[PDB]
Design a protein around this ligand. Sequence first.
Ligand SMILES: CO[C@@H]1[C@@H](n2cc(-c3cc(F)c(F)c(F)c3)nn2)[C@@H](O)[C@@H](CO)O[C@H]1C(=O)N(c1cc(Cl)cc(Cl)c1)[C@H]1CCCC[C@@H]1O
Length: 138
Amino acid sequence: PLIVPYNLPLPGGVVPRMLITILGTVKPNANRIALDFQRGNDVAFHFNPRFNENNRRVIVCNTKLDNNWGREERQSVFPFESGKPFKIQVLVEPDHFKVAVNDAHLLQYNHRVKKLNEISKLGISGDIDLTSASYTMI
Ligand SMILES: CO[C@@H]1[C@@H](n2cc(-c3cc(F)c(F)c(F)c3)nn2)[C@@H](O)[C@@H](CO)O[C@H]1C(=O)N(c1cc(Cl)cc(Cl)c1)[C@H]1CCCC[C@@H]1O
């Protein structure tokens, strides 16, 4: 177990077939979670569960380039619950990031940042108890 916020290095960046697993528990009164796949100051992929945006639960995904957020991709399917243990898996594929939560497919996010081998850090933040963050190649 680790204290959030936490940076996981991705040395040499990411590559297709790399599977990143984040295990934790959502805090009881959670408002937000974020994963930030970083290329320097750019965020190639921001994955952001919001537990109370205008009293709805939503997943927001985006990219930050030159310190500016781009066009959001939103999903209403919301597999997290306050207080419960979760597993987020991010599978890097040639054209997208694929996300599964608790072994169920959630979403795809097309690569906007093309330099996968420069996406060299994963920041983990928000209302969680972080158990582990690791990766392997499938
Ligand atoms: C709060 O800002 C968020 C960003 N955001 C979150 C976090 C964060 C930090 C943590 F430490 C953490 F633990 C955590 F879980 C999340 N950091 N940064 C991204 O989450 C971004 C992702 O697009 O959104 C921002 C956003 O809230 N807006 C927005 C604003 C602009 Cl300037 C530009 C666009 Cl494009 C959006 C909203 C505007 C009003 C209509 C809705 C819109 O969604």
